Structure 1
């Protein structure tokens, strides 16, 4: 025992408000919104330029057409490093955000995010034992504190674990098992809660290649898989050209340039999106395991001027509709990655300071795809 036990009040198993299976719950969610760069920000909830989460925001998210929110949460910076005890004040703040999301009739997925990297960048044999110990200690606390919420609340054990090979995959399977056991151990509604497990690098191709089995669960039919999606990188995230490749400003049938043609895609088009999603349908969905698509977005390039900009914006919108639509058609639940920014290279579709829509075009694209 590196750390004390935090499974200090285990409760009797409680199935009340927990009647849905993972498949049934996935049936209720078609469009999801990440509260990005907020509860996971290093330095505090407001450290990365977003205000504290308010009811008014969650209300706008609901009223705009989202069924669910994914809330990235940081924990390690709030914990005593000797004991792994998480601040009581932080636990209550997270609980409070969950409560308000569930009061606006949203499903809610809470994780341990990148979190400064303690687990995420350490899917390795040398770190396996210490990280399991912290995974267990944190999840005991988070689950105990959030135990009484009904099936509107789901937990995801990690964010984007960096497992690049079979030996790292084995370590990841260990981290994911530690998460399930920790949560189930607390009892209460946590005996039945739907949990979400992440694939290697949350990458479709690597998941298809390395994923072996789901963790063992004392509960029946209560697990989902998770991947993320930024294909093609050159369009969605790349901000400068490199020796290895050029940025794409434009994407989709009908929105390609004839003037700056080096800025059209050379890969990662519709057929590729289709092919990648079909891998997750076969590995998971077709086997009765839904798949959460926890993170996707193509950033805005507002450093373009004139018809270049207009064309980028059209393709950028279509990209979000196509991903949303083609993911839903295959049993993946799309959660848009929103960082709150309204400036160049950002992904915020709301203006968080005013509780209004900043990017109506991408909002409509998402809803149409939905």
Structure 2
């Protein structure tokens, strides 16, 4: 039966969120290019993370987060068209992990993540993609339909033109248009299940979850069956060279605060100031053995974001000193905060 649910607007729900944490490189890990039919365990552990436990989520809450984003890649667990049946064992594991969060009295965001092999924003793919989106979102929404307002569905992650010269610079006009259709389908698909899903808050991204003039001007918030339940998700690993470029500078100084203020103000001006709720569903700064700079960056990022009433969700991929992107914060195997000064900076 349905869990009793508070009917709150998106703004009201966002005002209950403090700061969030992503379970990164976990249920979002893909194996598509070498293992077509992974078991749930093969997927969850494919990218350097152990099997998730309740104790890990307990530690996230203890550290000061009250929200967990659970990115999930469904592609390697989805059957053939037209049913696109999701593997039952996978759906069961996703629910187990969601429950680690929900049963901790936390907010939880559940999405579809690395789907770009099929989630292609072109007119030629549009009808096929809308059909698959509806097929998979009906399955996810019905499994999770009984949950209360603490569970938020996010319809897509970073829809984009993979391999395009402007993949990460707004794509093209056609792609931005088609993404509006995909977000509209997602909203319609969830509302069609009724119950608590009729009044659940839902999150939708812009093109590549990017905030720029190009992606904002062409973005259309879906039409909804209920008022004030939609939130835009922007990922903002800013400033790029410091935070996300593995070859970029490791320095962040007083002089960089002004560019960060401008970047975050642009998110506010594009959405929150216009009465469109917005959340930074992923941010972070790579470990470059630069703790003083990351502490200064982190204190100011959260201070400025809060000053614009924008909640933030750290991207934690459990990676510290690898040759890849090291966005770890919680060392999941030791249950230790590896960068305590940075955690403290973001929690003040």
Same fold? TM cut 0.5? yes
Which of 34, 38, 43 aligns to 2:26? It is 38
Q: Say if 2:16 is the partner of 1:28.
A: yes
Cα gap change, 1:118 to 1:335, in 2 (>3 Å): same
> What is residue 217 of structure 2 aligned with on the other side?
210
> What is residue 349 of structure 1 aligned with on the other side?
329
In structure 2, runs of 5+ residues without a counterpart are 32-42, 161-169
Cα gap change, 1:73 to 1:123, in 2 (>3 Å): same
> What is residue 253 of structure 1 aligned with on the other side?
254
Residue 131 (structure 1) shift: 0.8
Secondary structure of 1:115's partner?
Answer: coil
> What is residue 155 of structure 1 aligned with on the other side?
153
- Does the CA-based 8 Å contact 1:110-1:156 persist in structure 2? yes
Structure 1 moving runs of 4+ over 6 Å: none
Q: Say if 2:281 is the partner of 1:294.
A: yes
> What is residue 18 of structure 1 aligned with on the other side?
6
Within a 5 Å distance, the mapping from 1:1-370 to structure 2 comes to 16-43=4-31, 44-82=43-81, 83-115=83-115, 117-119=117-119, 122-162=120-160, 163-206=170-213, 209-240=216-247, 247-253=248-254, 269-302=256-289, 312-344=290-322, 345-368=325-348
Residue 233 (structure 1) shift: 2.0
Secondary structure of 2:253's partner?
Answer: coil
Cα distance in 1 for residues equivalent to 2:217 and 2:207: 7
Cα gap change, 1:143 to 1:59, in 2 (>3 Å): same
Q: Which moved more, 1:154-163 or 1:64-73?
A: 154-163
Cα distance in 1 for residues equivalent to 2:65 and 2:219: 32
Residue 231 (structure 1) shift: 2.4
- Does the CA-based 8 Å contact 1:165-1:210 persist in structure 2? no
Q: Which moved more, 1:167-176 or 1:225-234?
A: 225-234
Residue 209 (structure 1) shift: 4.1
Secondary structure of 1:50's partner?
Answer: coil
Cα distance in 2 for residues equivalent to 1:292 and 1:26: 8
Q: Which moved more, 1:183-192 or 1:158-167?
A: 158-167
Secondary structure of 1:226's partner?
Answer: strand
Residue 22 (structure 1) shift: 0.4
Cα distance in 2 for residues equivalent to 1:334 and 1:184: 26
Residues paired across the two proteins, number = 325
TM-score (norm 2): 0.89
